[PDB]
Ligand binder design. Sequence first.
Ligand SMILES: Nc1ncnc2c1ncn2[C@@H]1O[C@H](CSCC[C@H](N)C(=O)O)[C@@H](O)[C@H]1O
Ligand SMILES: [Zn+2]
Lengths: 692, 294
Amino acid sequence: SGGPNTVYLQVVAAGSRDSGAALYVFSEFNRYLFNCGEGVQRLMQEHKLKVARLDNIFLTRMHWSNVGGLSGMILTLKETGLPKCVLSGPPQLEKYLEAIKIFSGPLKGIELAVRPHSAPEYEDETMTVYQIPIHSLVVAFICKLHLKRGNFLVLKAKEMGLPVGTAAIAPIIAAVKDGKSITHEGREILAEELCTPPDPGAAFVVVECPDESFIQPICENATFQRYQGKADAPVALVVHMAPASVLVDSRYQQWMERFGPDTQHLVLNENCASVHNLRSHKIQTQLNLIHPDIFPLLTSFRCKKEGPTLSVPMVQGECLLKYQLRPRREWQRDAIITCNPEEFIVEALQLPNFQQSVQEYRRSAQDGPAPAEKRSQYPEIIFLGTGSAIPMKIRNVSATLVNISPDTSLLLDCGEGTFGQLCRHYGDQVDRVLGTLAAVFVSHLAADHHTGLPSILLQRERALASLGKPLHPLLVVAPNQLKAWLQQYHNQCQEVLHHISMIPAKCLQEGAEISSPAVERLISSLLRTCDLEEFQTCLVRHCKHAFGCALVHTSGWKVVYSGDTMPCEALVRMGKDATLLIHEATLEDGLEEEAVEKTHSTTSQAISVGMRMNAEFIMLNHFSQRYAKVPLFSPNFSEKVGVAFDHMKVCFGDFPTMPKLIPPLKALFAGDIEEMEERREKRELRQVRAAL
Amino acid sequence: ATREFIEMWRLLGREVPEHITEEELKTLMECVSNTAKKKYLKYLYTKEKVKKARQIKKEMKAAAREEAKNIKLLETTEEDKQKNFLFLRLWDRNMDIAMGWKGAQAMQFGQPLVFDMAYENYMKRKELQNTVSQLLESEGWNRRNVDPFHIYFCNLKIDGALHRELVKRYQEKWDKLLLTSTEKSHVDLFPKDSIIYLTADSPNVMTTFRHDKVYVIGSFVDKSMQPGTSLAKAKRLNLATECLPLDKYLQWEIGNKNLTLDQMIRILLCLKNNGNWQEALQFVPKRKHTGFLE
RNA sequence: GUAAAUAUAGUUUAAAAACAUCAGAUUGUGAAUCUGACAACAGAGGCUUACCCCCUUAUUUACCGAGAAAGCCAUGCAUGGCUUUC
Ligand SMILES: Nc1ncnc2c1ncn2[C@@H]1O[C@H](CSCC[C@H](N)C(=O)O)[C@@H](O)[C@H]1O
Ligand SMILES: [Zn+2]
């Protein structure tokens, strides 16, 4: 039933240690993805990749780094309205699918099928997929394109005087397409004579090789030997997802050489250097102009030495890398991302009042007095993402890190892809930074606020290998539901809880009662590790099992984080005269009814609590896409107001400086200011229409 | 070989023209491949079809007029108006002469209105033909008006494609059109303060027509959308920009917010003659909006 | 930003006509014409005779995370609160 048209392969993820190993294929009939991994939702959204018709999702290995992001993709598909979706992998995924339910949310009108390894074939007559198991467990997939022999030779039908312009000729097409020989124009014409040499379909293999224990078995594969040498269906290309060390193995090199020049040997690994978000780099570079350390340059991956020149070609993978297969097989590297910081700088410079505002701020700061009291740089606070929902290009799911001391760091809102921002923000020092972590805090029970919890832990082990320190089960505080579903994942899909230690949030509540002596020992160790004096948890009235946290150190500085909540007196009592407050800010004023319905406060409520808190400074967080790029500004806001952005660095000494940055911010958002003006006009029109 | 494969696709049954000229084949060859040539061939075929249909209709009407003329001859009633006529029937000539006098008066004392022909690099051949046709319609609408503008054709390169097409289309009338055509820009002819550059992407919204302001319309037809081109050009010279009020007065419904040159000039002429915004915006195509906001 | 629809380059209804546009005609009162110019249903890409789709912009509309099972407390077999399981 028909034949496939032009088909394209794409490298969604460059293969870096942060959000790597993501492959994509698209044709007119349908499209597919391999190794969704983690954080690929934002990457696809930024690059305008179509998510519709992504019926099938594939993978190579059970590691969370290959399957962590399924939740976001399935939720996006559910929002779109696609009714069906299927997965391919080991049977244990079924249990893993069940796991997602515990934090899936309302899932309806969507089918979650599975394609175990035992399945013989998939077919669909568009593209065929082969399942190949591996053992020391990994699965690789060989995909063969469908046959498209349908063709007709030029001008020889006219020489034969075929009865064109009629209907009875249409069936005859099949006679020549199927392979029938007929007598026409006094010639016993064969079908092959009037048919272009059929092409059964290009083939390509996707495989991940963790180490030599998986290098050895692959060669002793009958399926691979079938396509090695004089393959029945010659392989157009092969994509390898393995590190450089695996890529240089003698057995691996020989296996690669087996195919010969026919293949192209595209590769993907950590060594690849590229940018996964042009917008993020552009905005952070532009912000770096205003002040260096508040907006530090985002270190970009840059491999020191290119991989060794192996005998076979090694096509290093890159983000947005494109390869057309039909009707031509070539590297269509036309829309590959490029790094041009100077272009971004000049584009920002060519804005109204931006450079002038920056110069005025420079003059004010230079003339301003030096910080009194010589406040110590530590502790530091870095906001990785401030998004409140499915992450967008501008922002990211809420996530913050507080460095109490160069050897003590705490994490709040370990959302989806947090490790990605950690990598993008701390380059190679990520190892030291991860080793610095003492514990991770969990906000109100919700998938967005704990999506990325597993990946971090795994990476920590790797960091521990780099430092060589003894195993240290990382501490985390959260309700028992987190423990339950993490245990299910541990005992079903991938064993991770042995690397973690859990603490109920209730036991940390004000006036709480110790549940067990082990809990007391764990909390005492937590307090000792970060040199903290008091860690307080309080209930918040936005949903069941929700906690807001407060940190009080020996130096006396009190920092209070709330997350999803509404103005609560208990919060004020807990954080009375707090040094700093970071509070959610989802919607704008005048929308109190929907704010109550969604159980999220607005700006006016933020100022009301802040003045109620009596805290020295207040910071806004947890924003929505409606505030695409700019937060609300008004002189009515106190100087204590603080607006967060991706990878925003702040310290105590910066408290008297945040308001001074208000102008330049709005200076950079001129187009976004116009967008806000249009949005306000639309809101006014809607409100007046509703009132009348 | 070339016309051979063209005849091959003819045999394929594709809609193609007949007895095509050499320039048309050159233009077809200029196309890249496949769809471009197919669209051009379908165009030319439809053009020939319309031409032949008009020829048939014209011949039918000629024969009908001949037979009806003999029938009207059969009456011979005579006594037609008693031959009491005050004027000869030379009305088209008189209308042309009156329009010429009005155009001279406008060239001497009329309000300037500029079409800047600085987009030849942003337009394909088809868009260039469309721009020329709309320029003719706009100029014609200006001539008939009770108070014509003084039309300037600024940035019009002498040997450029647009000037060549305008000359070809106007013939000897080109040298007699009562308008100022010059290679210089609108900024070299008028003070920068009096120039308002009309664009659909300007932040500012036009409120009232000003009689001491020189309005600049971009003689640009982009069926391939290129937003901000006219705004970008106006920004290099640092000229004030205004946009027609279409969200304020019309419920836009479905359509494109950039009007044609003829519609723009008709709106501006209605405004210049003390017309209101409803009357002026009656020239917006009805298919786009749904009504005038009350 | 994401899904839907829609896109007539002079206008409208249709699926090609009518009204319009430019040049020439010193027109005997139907010039209510004659001779010409223009004629592209948003922009780009195939593919089987014909069978449609894929993509990019533009306009309008609506916009992202808790099912059941068992044990207890209160209300009038049903409801609210909590605890363990997936
Ligand atoms: N809504 C509107 N407001 C103001 N000028 C408009 C307009 N619609 C059309 N125009 C005028 O008509 C011209 C042809 S429309 C071409 C628009 C093109 N995007 C551009 O860059 O201009 C425009 O250049 C502008 O001069
Ligand atoms: Zn949140």
